[PDB]
Design a protein around this ligand. Sequence first.
Ligand SMILES: [Zn+2]
Ligand SMILES: [Zn+2]
Lengths: 55, 55
Amino acid sequence: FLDGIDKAQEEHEKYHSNWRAMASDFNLPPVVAKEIVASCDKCQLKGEAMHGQVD
Amino acid sequence: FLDGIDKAQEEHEKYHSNWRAMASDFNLPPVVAKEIVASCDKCQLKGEAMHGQVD
Ligand SMILES: [Zn+2]
Ligand SMILES: [Zn+2]
């Protein structure tokens, strides 16, 4: 569980975009791969949340 | 993994807000509990994403 995530966790590269590849590389069910996406803010949120303010 | 999520998965009640309680109830590491939060859109996104449009 946590140990698999530590080795799987790395820089936000192309592997982060395709979480399915990581699950196959470690042969783990999408459950562990999805958690990494949830922890990585870049992989979780796509566009910006609020528009901020109008200048 | 997936089987634990099916039993853990339910309606968005108070348990969904406190994911730590669910992990203790099933004695599973925050990894499985976090995945449920990532899958449940209500638990994942807090406020609204884009402001939509200005009327
Ligand atoms: Zn990432
Ligand atoms: Zn929920």
